């Protein structure tokens, strides 16, 4: 199937507070395999999934110095947005980016991308084409311009279509032993009284992994669309996931209403009757 | 790796 | 283009005496650098900064101060000059990769 | 990310063919870059290698290959004449977006 590798990367400012915090965190198709904080005691690179312990020091100390290069980096883009802005000087601001690249099971590059976002709004991307950016606003065009007047496009490219690609397919080696693992979510329905002589179903999936799941409630064929409820799939705290999907019946009635829960570390989609 | 980012 | 000028071309200071090296540039570009030239050690970089209000010690800091007022221009401050300066200084603009440099400044400390 | 030039000059006879050895030390793949420089002024680019292609083209006849391998990025130019008497320099880039020269390469070609 299709993988990724993108570095989510997050600078605030913390006015009064002294230097913007910074951190650069690592994700191989959604898993965080490495983190960098300014805020801990000594601010290294660090493995955040064990097979990325057979990295030698090296890699540590160069992804190190790089963080450590890319933090005063962006130190002054947010000082840069206070002008562009023309902001308060004591306001704490944010600055986000993700950058990476999606390629498929052919080893082809299906995507490339580093977008921006300032204090939760995006500020500028980098197109498709790879060779162009798409600023949000007027403050985005400067640095739009800025960016193609030192060809910073054609380097960016150079690292998506090339490094990303290329340190992709080294952690998907290091990793495959890990990252193809599949959980089975173990399904069950709940029973809950409810007033004028109602009933709610609670369809429950727990312990799956990946996070990906799709739970549906069924009645007479057609699955309910309507008043039916569904929290955010959520994190039990050890690697594994949990989600809910409820739906309100009449009492009396609720075995015709079926549950369908689609996780891919099923052999078969499971079906839940109360 | 990383990138080494521009500054806007 | 990507024009970098240093101010001045030459100059003739002695021991104890204050020099300043400025580069003015119009390629806009976000990062700056000062080198210094010299037969067996080729280009070496004494500052460099990320921008306006940014300025990190190089590999060869020691003896020299660097102040980055605004995009435009970086300076190389020498408040005491000692015959070890004697050179060829080269600031550069660069835009996350390729640099580009002025045309040198002769620079000659004497005793 | 280091890089060295080993050989301080090299002497060849115009028409003939010409290879300007570069050595890099780095753990990872680096950016690599070649400059000129001619008698009494700063560098300028020949070519320089981001990733990709390991074989690339610059300005006048110039080219350079990399080399993970040997972990080199020697530059070439078919048929030198006379006016690529210069000064070559051979740089690079990882950790920091600054460039770390080689000490340089002296070409004379003789005409």
């Known amino acids: 199937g299709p993988h990724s590798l993108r570095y989510f990367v997050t600078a605030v400012s913390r006015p009064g507070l002294g230097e913007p915090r910074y951190m650069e965190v690592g994700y191989v198709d959604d898993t965080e395999f490495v983190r960098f904080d300014s805020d801990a005691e000594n601010p290294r690179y660090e493995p955040r999934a064990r097979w990325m312990e057979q990295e030698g020091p090296e890699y540590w100390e160069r992804e190190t110095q790089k963080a450590k290069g890319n933090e005063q980096s962006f130190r002054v883009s947010l000082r840069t947005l206070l002008g562009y802005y023309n902001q308060s000087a004591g306001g704490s601001h944010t600055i986000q980016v993700i950058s990476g690249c999606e390629v498929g099971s052919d080893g082809r590059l299906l995507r490339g991308y580093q977008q921006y976002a300032y204090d939760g709004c995006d500020y500028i991307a980098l197109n498709e084409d790879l060779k162009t950016w798409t600023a949000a606003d007027m403050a985005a065009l400067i640095t739009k311009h800025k960016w193609e007047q030192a060809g910073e496009a054609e380097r960016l490219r150079a690292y998506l279509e090339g490094t990303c690609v290329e340190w992709l397919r080294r952690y998907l080696k290091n990793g495959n032993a890990t990252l193809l693992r599949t959980d089975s979510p173990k399904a069950h329905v709940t029973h809950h009284s409810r007033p004028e002589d109602k009933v709610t179903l609670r369809c429950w999936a727990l312990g799956f992994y990946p996070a990906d799941i799709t739970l549906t409630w069924q009645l007479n064929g057609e699955e309910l669309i309507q008043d039916m409820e569904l929290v955010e799939t959520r994190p039990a705290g050890d690697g594994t996931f949990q989600k809910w999907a409820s739906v309100v019946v009449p009492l009396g009635k609720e075995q015709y209403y079926t549950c369908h829960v689609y996780h891919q570390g099923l052999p078969e989609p499971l079906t839940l009757r109360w | 790796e990383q990138y080494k980012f521009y500054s806007v | 283009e990507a024009a970098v000028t240093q101010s001045p071309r030459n100059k003739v200071a002695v021991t104890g005496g204050k020099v300043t090296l400025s580069c003015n540039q119009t390629?806009?570009?976000?990062?700056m650098y000062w080198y210094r030239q010299d037969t067996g050690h080729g280009l070496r970089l004494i500052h460099y900064?990320?921008?306006?209000?940014?300025?990190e010690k190089g590999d060869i800091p020691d003896g020299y101060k660097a102040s980055r007022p605004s995009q435009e221009n970086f300076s190389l401050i020498l408040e005491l000059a000692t015959p070890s300066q004697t050179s060829v200084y080269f600031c550069?603009?660069?835009?996350?990769?390729?640099?580009?440099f002025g045309a040198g400044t002769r620079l000659s400390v004497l005793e | 990310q280091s890089v060295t030039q080993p050989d301080a000059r090299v002497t060849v006879s115009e028409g003939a063919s010409l290879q300007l050895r570069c050595k890099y030390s780095?753990?990872?793949?680096?950016?690599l870059f070649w400059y000129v420089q001619y008698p009494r002024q700063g560098l300028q680019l020949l070519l320089k290698?981001?990733?990709?292609?390991?074989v690339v083209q610059g300005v006048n006849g110039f080219e350079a290959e990399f080399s993970k391998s040997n972990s080199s990025f020697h530059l070439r130019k078919a048929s030198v004449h006379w006016s690529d008497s210069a000064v070559y320099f051979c740089?690079?880039?990882?950790?920091?977006?600054?460039?770390?020269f080689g000490s340089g390469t002296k070409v004379i070609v003789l005409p």
């Open positions: 550069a603009s660069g835009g996350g990769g390729t640099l580009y």
């Open positions: 780095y753990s990872a793949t680096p950016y």
């Open positions: 290698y981001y990733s990709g292609d390991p």
């Open positions: 740089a690079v880039s990882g950790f920091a977006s600054a460039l770390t």
């Open positions: 390629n806009n570009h976000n990062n």
């Open positions: 900064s990320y921008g306006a209000g940014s300025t």
